Symmetry: C3
């Protein structure tokens, strides 16, 4: 019943921290893939 | 050793709740992008 | 304060186990989509 609390902070921080990563990942990839002509 | 249990419900609910979201997200986008001609 | 520890193993194993899956998923799709000419 208590663990649930962690499930909320984990479920959110999970999909959250992920998006944050996949975000800077797409940006870094979008940039590196823009140094060409 | 016990926390693991939560890791199973979290690991699953994590990738699960995620797909569920990205799912209704692609559907809502696929629909809104289908109201045109 | 302690739960955090699990948040580290969960947050990582979360985005980790995920990539691992989406990985073998893209590979299987990349392969099946390579048996053609």
């Amino acid at each position: 019943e208590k663990t649930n609390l962690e499930i909320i902070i984990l479920e959110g921080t999970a999909v959250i921290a992920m998006f944050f990563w996949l975000l800077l990942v797409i940006i870094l990839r979008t940039v590196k893939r823009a140094n060409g002509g």
